[PDB]
Amino acid sequence: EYLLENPTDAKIVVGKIIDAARAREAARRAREMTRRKGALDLAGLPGKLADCQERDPALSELYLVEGDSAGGSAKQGRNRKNQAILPLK
DNA sequence: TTTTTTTTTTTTTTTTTTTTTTTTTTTTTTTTTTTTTTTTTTTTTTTTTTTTTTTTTTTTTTTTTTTTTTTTTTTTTTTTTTTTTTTTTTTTTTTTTTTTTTTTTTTTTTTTTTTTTT
Structure with missing residues (x-):
């Protein structure tokens, strides 16, 4: 409710968060995209x-x-965007 | 308000590689054919007393050609070295024991839907 009420402060905080996220992303190692199972x-x-x-x-x-x-217990509860599971034997 | 630059996934189809269906050659496996062993009995072979006329060894003496013999020079024998094979320590790998962690499959039964063939 506060974020919907205050657009200017919300935009300022979002700019701060975006700057922090960019600072986090800059320091990461170089890499390339990988095909994922689908x-x-x-x-x-x-x-x-x-x-x-x-x-x-x-x-x-x-x-x-x-x-x-x-494997099934972990697959039912997870985040499909980031997390993958490989059950061993 | 019109007009201009750049970005990527698709029209893609062809090159490279991978996967999946194939069938020549040396190692197994079932069959027939030839080596082994135990009984019957069977004429047949073979073991053992007696007699007998034989034919080869032992009295005696003879010689000659194999047994004496010495010596030259070869040539098999032995020495060192190295290679090839045999045989045994060494190491590695794999299997089984008993409590633990994990999983994976084949069929009945009915009824309804896809998914190929005619």
């Missing part, structure tokens, strides 16, 4: 992998879990 294309990755939507590394995670039951 419905239309699998990219030759395992069936057990439950990959994420984010194509950029440094904004994605891989959770190495112990089995298929733990």
